[PDB]
Design a protein around this motif. Structure first.
Motif, PDB file in Angstrom:
ATOM      1  N   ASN A 103       0.827  -1.203   0.000  1.00  0.00           N
ATOM      2  CA  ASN A 103       0.000   0.000   0.000  1.00  0.00           C
ATOM      3  C   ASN A 103       0.863   1.256   0.000  1.00  0.00           C
ATOM      4  N   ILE A 104       1.715   1.406   1.017  1.00  0.00           N
ATOM      5  CA  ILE A 104       2.602   2.563   1.080  1.00  0.00           C
ATOM      6  C   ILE A 104       3.636   2.519  -0.040  1.00  0.00           C
ATOM      7  N   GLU A 107       2.179   3.999  -2.720  1.00  0.00           N
ATOM      8  CA  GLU A 107       1.636   5.293  -2.321  1.00  0.00           C
ATOM      9  C   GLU A 107       2.648   6.414  -2.520  1.00  0.00           C
ATOM     10  N   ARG A 108       3.908   6.175  -2.161  1.00  0.00           N
ATOM     11  CA  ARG A 108       4.940   7.200  -2.225  1.00  0.00           C
ATOM     12  C   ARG A 108       5.717   7.175  -3.538  1.00  0.00           C
ATOM     13  N   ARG A 109       5.158   6.562  -4.582  1.00  0.00           N
ATOM     14  CA  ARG A 109       5.718   6.591  -5.934  1.00  0.00           C
ATOM     15  C   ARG A 109       7.102   5.936  -5.992  1.00  0.00           C
ATOM     16  N   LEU A 151      -5.417   1.965  -5.848  1.00  0.00           N
ATOM     17  CA  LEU A 151      -4.592   3.080  -5.396  1.00  0.00           C
ATOM     18  C   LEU A 151      -3.657   3.555  -6.500  1.00  0.00           C
TER      19      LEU A 151
ATOM     20  N   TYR C  36      -0.421  12.145   2.474  1.00  0.00           N
ATOM     21  CA  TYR C  36      -0.735  10.817   1.947  1.00  0.00           C
ATOM     22  C   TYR C  36      -1.426  11.008   0.604  1.00  0.00           C
ATOM     23  N   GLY C  37      -0.640  10.964  -0.467  1.00  0.00           N
ATOM     24  CA  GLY C  37      -1.149  11.258  -1.782  1.00  0.00           C
ATOM     25  C   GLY C  37      -1.441  12.733  -1.929  1.00  0.00           C
TER      26      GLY C  37
ATOM     27  N   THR D  53       5.871  12.916  -5.670  1.00  0.00           N
ATOM     28  CA  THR D  53       6.316  12.399  -4.377  1.00  0.00           C
ATOM     29  C   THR D  53       6.231  13.451  -3.274  1.00  0.00           C
ATOM     30  N   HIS D  54       5.927  13.017  -2.052  1.00  0.00           N
ATOM     31  CA  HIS D  54       5.839  13.910  -0.899  1.00  0.00           C
ATOM     32  C   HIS D  54       6.574  13.255   0.260  1.00  0.00           C
TER      33      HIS D  54
END
Lengths: 603, 105, 115, 64
Positions: A103-104, A107-109, A151, C36-37, D53-54
């Motif tokens: 998931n993460i 999520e963070r590309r 997602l 988060y996104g 990205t973050h």
């Protein structure tokens, strides 16, 4: 100080201290935990309540050597016979449950990290039923159907989403822990073009082609809705435009389409639009929801899609032509017949309860939190309801003695012509202008009405307290109303308390109304005419569909003689689907036409 | 040619929207009733207010005079604002666009 | 001092301090709590912004009567959110309170004067 | 119009007694930096256009 040291080592991304801790940790494995061999090692890595373990912390914090961190972690995990629940750890929180590594990771590309995890093994079917992942409103979290596959689609990631498709391990059939399938999640996430580069539309096609079957659009959530009307219920045009105008041409998947070209003989091509959940025959339909939702500000272009206007304009002649004139003629006969009875006081009786019964259940059962557009349609229903109410109480007061028998009738007398305006906007000529007549009353005239009454009543009673002369009651308000029209007589002033202020107050009242109050009338005309006049017909079409939907609901089951039956059997596979003819001519491009299913052009 | 079209496009549009209000309100006061009783006196009374003549109230019979002046107040304010709105506003659209297509017609 | 003398650009940088690197991140006013996104929540410090303290930026800005650039001065990041949200918490139960009392004051005096 | 918008709320706050801490943003958010406490305020701004990205954050879990 071991568990925290490991967390701190990966927090800053230790290039080599992490390996040293692993050597120290594996040396501690020689000690007998006396309870379990892998559980204590997992407990030493897991942070109990948070459950981040060594996977979340390494992925939550991004380091230039992150790929080396997971590679070393996987090597230690593989050599210790821990590659199952260790990597499949779930968040042990109240607001977070079921969240896994993948998931993460997506999520963070991190595409490279995502491919590494799925190669060794990942929980691609994980569901995040936590509070944050399933918010009750907008500003509490990100809603994506709590599935890692969706997602990637939601976060504008087109590479890894197809990578999971070839894995032959996804759970596209399994909707989610909430009720919304992957397409249901994808359509809800989408928004207008002003904030996105129509990426949802592109990935909607990509996911559907991988499905190759109809079970995606034949599922219902807890609320019981299909992806077709989920775009229409929430007011989403671009995602709905692609769904209805599905023009798939290649084979082996042509069934997953809604637009089929029946025959193209030269520049005359007839396209068939599927109507599985569009027409009102089914229980819940797109047309029924779109017309009666009162929650969409983009209905100007939402109603003019391909299989909507043809089902709209044609049904006007089949249904509304014999219904709009039917109500107009009956109401017109109702008007003069009541007019003659009222004027001759020294059909209407039976029709009196017709409006009350119809409007009584319509307003009570509607309750849409409407009237955001002020004009809307319930405004006429309120006028209709009061007119019916005033009529029945007029019959009630006929044998109730007392007085004001004519007062109720006169109030209902003028209210009848007020509803006649709503019957004049349906004409194809006056419809382009009748809507703006209504808006001026409810935007400019009403604004001028209350700002004048607040001054007229306030100043009128002021002179009444000051007082062959206009003493009080209605003489005070009449006196000022004659000055604002050009009549009346000034001063006289039979009582001398302070006549200087009496003329001064009248001087102020006339100059304020004829300058300040007149300023707010003409000035609004400049803004409205120069801007709103180009949006009159567009608003007119909004009320166009309100009548036909109401007429269809009251019409009994006797049908199948005015609307498009459009059987057109053997359209695809060995089933039957309703269709609709368009007969669109291009006459400009030509360049051959070979996309068709019926060789003979037919009718 | 443009003189003819204003009669059949704007004046006629203003004619029926005013008659539907004039006749409707006129007969309302006639049923309510040295005074303007009925027949042509009701329609004449409202037509004098829209031109600048006539006398108000008097009200020789007292059934509910509050609505009598209120209805007249609404009638005058509607005709001089709403009904006058649809007259001048059409002039802006027609003159700026149709005036260049007069000789062609 | 930037708000008292009516200076927007120097105040815009101070309030929207988005320092990202370490060893000096404390000297900032905008901290990203979580991203988060495409959902990022930023924290704006309110050491001397809200009215809790003795002298505050919001109190000075509203009641100085010496700034002609208040059109964009009041719409900074940690100002409008502290403005619009406080309207429902405070003004909703106060603007209607004064309006209703004043409205009842109007007719009650109207009836007494006319009677 | 917005100029007079803030005039009323400031006047209302001044007449309101010390009884508070139930309508305005308390925003404690301890351990924001070093080992002290600073009041904060939530915005929840969505960009939805840049992504890329973050990684700039202080709390790993998104929280409430």
């Amino acid at each position: 100080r071991l568990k925290k040291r490991i967390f701190a080592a990966v927090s800053e991304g230790c290039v080599e201290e992490l390996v040293e801790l692993l050597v120290e940790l594996q040396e501690l494995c020689r000690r007998r935990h006396d309870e379990d061999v892998p559980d204590f090692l997992m407990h030493k890595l897991t942070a109990s309540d948070t459950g981040k373990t060594c996977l979340m912390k390494a992925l939550l914090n991004i380091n230039p050597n992150t790929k080396e961190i997971v590679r070393i972690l996987l090597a230690f995990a593989e050599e210790n016979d821990i590659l199952g629940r260790f990597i499949n750890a779930e968040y042990t929180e109240e607001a977070y449950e079921g969240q896994t590594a993948l998931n993460i990771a997506i999520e963070r590309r991190q595409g490279d990290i995502a491919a590494l995890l799925i190669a060794a093994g990942a929980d691609v079917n994980a569901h995040a039923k936590g509070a944050f992942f399933n918010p009750k409103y907008q500003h509490e979290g990100f809603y994506f159907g709590e599935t890692p596959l969706a997602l990637a689609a939601c976060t504008n990631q087109p590479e890894i989403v197809q990578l999971l498709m070839e894995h032959e391990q996804t759970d596209i059939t399994s909707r989610d822990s909430r009720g919304n399938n992957i397409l249901h999640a994808l359509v809800t996430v989408a928004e207008d073009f002003k904030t996105q580069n129509d990426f949802v539309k592109r990935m909607y096609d990509m996911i559907l082609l991988r499905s190759g079957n109809w079970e995606l659009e034949t599922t219902r959530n807890n609320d019981g809705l299909t992806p077709l009307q989920l775009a229409a219920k929430m007011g989403k045009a671009e995602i709905l435009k692609y769904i209805l105008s599905r023009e798939i041409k290649e084979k082996r998947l042509r069934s997953l389409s809604r637009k089929f070209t029946d025959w193209a003989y030269g520049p005359v091509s007839s396209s068939l639009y599927d109507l599985t959940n569009v027409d009102t025959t089914t229980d819940n339909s797109v047309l029924e929801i779109t017309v009666y939702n009162t929650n969409i500000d983009n209905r100007h272009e939402m109603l003019t899609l391909e299989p909507l206007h043809t089902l709209l304009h044609m049904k006007w002649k089949k249904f509304a032509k014999h219904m709009f004139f039917l109500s107009f003629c009956f109401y017109f006969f109702y008007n003069i017949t009541l007019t003659l009875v009222s004027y001759y006081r020294p059909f209407v009786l039976i029709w009196a309860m017709c409006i009350s019964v119809k409007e009584g259940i319509a307003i009570f059962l509607l309750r849409p939190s409407d009237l955001q557009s002020i004009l809307s349609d319930a405004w006429f229903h309120f006028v209709f309801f009061i007119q019916a109410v005033l009529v029945i109480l007029s019959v009630f007061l006929y044998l109730f003695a007392y007085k004001e028998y004519l007062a109720c009738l006169v109030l209902a007398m003028a209210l009848g012509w007020a509803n006649m305006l709503y019957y004049t906007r349906g004409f194809q000529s006056m419809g382009m202008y009748s809507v703006m007549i209504q808006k001026v009353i409810l935007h400019d005239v009403l604004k001028f009405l209350f700002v004048y009454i607040v001054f007229l009543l306030g100043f009128g009673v002021a002179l009444a307290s000051l007082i062959s002369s206009y003493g009080s009651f209605s003489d005070a308000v009449l006196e000022l109303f004659k000055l604002t029209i050009g009549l009346g007589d000034l001063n006289i002033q039979q009582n001398s308390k302070y006549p200087i202020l009496f003329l001064f107050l009248l001087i102020t009242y006339v100059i304020l109304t004829f300058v300040l109050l007149l300023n707010m009338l003409i000035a609004l005309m400049g803004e409205t005419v120069e801007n709103v006049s180009k949006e009159s017909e567009r608003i007119w079409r909004l009320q166009r569909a309100r009548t036909i939907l109401e007429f269809e609901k009251m019409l009994p089951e006797w049908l199948r003689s005015r609307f498009r039956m459009g059987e057109l059997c053997k359209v695809a596979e060995d089933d039957f689907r309703l269709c609709l003819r368009i007969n669109e001519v291009k006459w400009t491009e030509w360049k051959t036409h070979v996309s068709f299913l019926n060789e003979d052009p037919g009718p």
